Amino acid sequence: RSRLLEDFRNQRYPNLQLRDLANHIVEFSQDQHGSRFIQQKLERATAAEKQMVFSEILAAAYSLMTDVFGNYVIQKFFEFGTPEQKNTLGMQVKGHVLQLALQMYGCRVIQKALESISPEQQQEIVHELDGHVLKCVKDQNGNHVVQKCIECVDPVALQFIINAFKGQVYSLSTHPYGCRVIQRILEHCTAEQTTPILDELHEHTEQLIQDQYGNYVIQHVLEHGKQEDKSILINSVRGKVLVLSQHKFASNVVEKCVTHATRGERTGLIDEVCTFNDNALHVMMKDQYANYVVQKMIDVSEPTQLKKLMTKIRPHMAALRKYTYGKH
Amino acid sequence: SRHCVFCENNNEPEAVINSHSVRDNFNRVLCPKLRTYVCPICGASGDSAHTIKYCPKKPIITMEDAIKAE
RNA sequence: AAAUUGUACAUA
Ligand SMILES: [Zn+2]
Ligand SMILES: [Zn+2]
């Protein structure tokens, strides 16, 4: 360290002001207490000192953004600065957005920028990252950025990603990070962008529900998509309710299936689980996952199915009392 | 959490309930009542002991299996 | 008597 950072890491300047940080902000932003101080005292005074801090760091931006503490600095600037500074920062960032998005703190900052900059520069960054869709969605950091873009940009500009997904919607709806990207896609797009991806999903529906991540995709379509898609998925389960209420992942899909449904779908599935060969009811009330399906069935049915069900498995109650289930 | 759920839902006396936890800081099994039990399905005992409903080999039951069992 | 009820979402 130099002199001033050894003077302030011991805290010897209780009345410090931005102007007092001259010629040491590159070292202050690399220290915790210094990045907190610069961060918290950049809302008062005039913009002259803020212009100073902007100038002393515009020379080390490519490192302060890939810095564990400088990234809060760059963030706060992208949030509070005059648009001239927004553009002046925005400029030198292009040419390395691949690397800066692969790196942790740089991608935190990238996210922080997309909610305050201009739409035009935004689309500049969009056209920056074409094609690499593969290596970017399949990353611990690229996927968060991708999500923030799905939240903040115009869908039609992003439509190229809708074309980089065909042939891959399966191997990505089953991907630990891709599935979030797919949920963001379905919750933030147009009809003509969700349509091909939704068909791609309706292809591999079977293997998707028994996957520990695709079932979040299904669950997301069941409580947010159009009624039509809901019915389309609801029918591709009739015949397997017992086999799936026993599955650890698919059981949640069953719950969120009986919740959102029409009277004909609810009554249809209730009828399917009414024709179970006695001991399969025992599998239901007994098995560690099915009983959740049972209860979410008890809570959302119409009173006709209610009184035609409180009796249907009323004997097995006696075999359920020694568990944790207190059902009146 | 300063008490064992298993011994509580099994209605063991309150002293036993608050005398141990179910599992471990290492995520083994700690409750002696549950450590004594040998799984009739997978034989596992003690450190990985578990009851039948939660056994990792409790087989998936189809419809045709529910028909054969009659 | 075998009883505990169930899966994701990142920086000091
Ligand atoms: Zn115990
Ligand atoms: Zn076992």
Residue numbers in the entry:
A (entry chain A): 1092 to 1419
B (entry chain B): 316 to 385
What's in the article?
Pum is a founding member of the Pum/fem-3 mRNA-binding factor (FBF), or PUF family, of eukaryotic RBPs. Pum binds with high affinity to specific sequences in target mRNAs and represses protein expression and enhances mRNA degradation. Regulation of hb mRNA by Pum relies on the spatial distribution of Nos, a tandem CCHC Zn finger (ZF) RBP. Here, we report the crystal structures of Nos-Pum-RNA complexes, which reveal that Nos acts as a molecular clamp that embraces both Pum and RNA.
We determined a 3.7 Å crystal structure that reveals the molecular architecture of the Nos-Pum-RNA ternary complex. We crystalized Pum and Nos with a hb NRE2 RNA, 5´-AAAUUGUACAUAAGCC (the core PRE sequence is underlined, and we designate the first U of the core PRE as position +1 and number the four upstream nucleotides as −1 to −4). Strikingly, the structure illustrates how the Nos tandem ZFs envelop the RNA bases immediately upstream of the PRE and, together with the C-terminal region, embrace both the RNA and Pum. Comparison of the ternary and binary complexes reveals that the addition of Nos and the upstream nucleotides induces localized conformational changes in Pum that promote Nos-Pum interaction and binding of Pum to RNA upstream of the core PRE site. Loop residues between repeats R7 and R8 rearrange in the ternary complex to promote interaction of F1367Pum with the C-terminal α helix of Nos. In addition, the C-terminal α helix of Pum (helix α2 of repeat R8´) unfolds to promote interaction of residues with the upstream RNA backbone. The protein-protein interactions observed between Nos and Pum are focused between the C-terminal end of Nos (I376Nos to E385Nos) and the non-RNA-binding convex surface of Pum in repeats R7 and R8. For example, the side chain of Q1337Pum is within hydrogen bonding distance of main chain N and O atoms of I376Nos. The crystal structure of the Nos-Pum-hb RNA complex reveals that Nos binds to three nucleotides upstream of the core PRE when it joins the ternary complex, and we find that repression activity is highly sensitive to mutation of the interface. The first base upstream of the PRE, -1U, is inserted into a hydrophobic binding pocket formed by F321Nos, T366Nos, and Y369Nos. The O4 atom of −1U is near the main chain N atom of T366Nos.
